[PDB]
Amino acid sequence: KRPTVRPRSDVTHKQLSAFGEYVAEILPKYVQQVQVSCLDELEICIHPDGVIPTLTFLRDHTNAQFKSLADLTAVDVPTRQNRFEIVYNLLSLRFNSRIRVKTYADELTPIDSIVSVHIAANWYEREVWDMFGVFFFNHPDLRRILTDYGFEGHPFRKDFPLTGYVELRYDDEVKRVVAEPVELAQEFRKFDLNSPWEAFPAYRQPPE
């Protein structure tokens, strides 16, 4: 009715809630949380030990048939103990649906790679390792894919600086392309673009 508000269909929410209950009761050993967002997207948060069984079940089940992996990514939230949140978005062409599977890791506990389940996970887990430093067990070839050759540090982490630590320039004395500690002619001006007034009362956290 309202031309400025996105229309909402509740049948997708009901279907995804039913499928979330379905997956949660099928796999109680690994599934830690099931939620359906206001956007009608199903998220299932699992233990890191159950990444292989969860992905295999979602790919090979008759009711799931999530044979297409949309993407594989990581989110760095460095306030929790397992700071890397690994997110698997999957697409079911048989049922025209999309699902999200979440798990956690830190800098020193690797999680199982799903190259045996989906083949795009090869390059996607290479990207995740190169950007965040999350190791993957039983990978065919885990190495850097996006950074420079011999790049030291994982740049998509929150504590990594935006400009980095080294910069490249041509030195004529050695006739090479050499790396220097980074110096900027103009420093990146950080902007404090946060209003001191609360925007969304629905997400008001309780006081500590």
Partner: protein, 97 residues
Amino acid sequence: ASATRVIQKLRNWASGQDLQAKLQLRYQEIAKRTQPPPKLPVGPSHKLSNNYYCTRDGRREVVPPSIIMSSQKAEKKAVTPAPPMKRWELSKDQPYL
């Protein structure tokens, strides 16, 4: 468009298509570079009454996601995430090339 009839016939025979009907060079059929000034209409919220922002605040209707089950907070027929996709019908316009 300035081509002679002999060259036009040669081009049409050599390409197999009527080329003078659809020329890729724009000559005069395009719009004028100078246009009359427009008057763009206003949206649905351009009214002087019954237009309180709380009645059309779609940004504030977003809620945190509903927890179906949680490990700390929390005979039936098996279900699917959605009904199975209907098979696509063949094109009635041009099904094959």
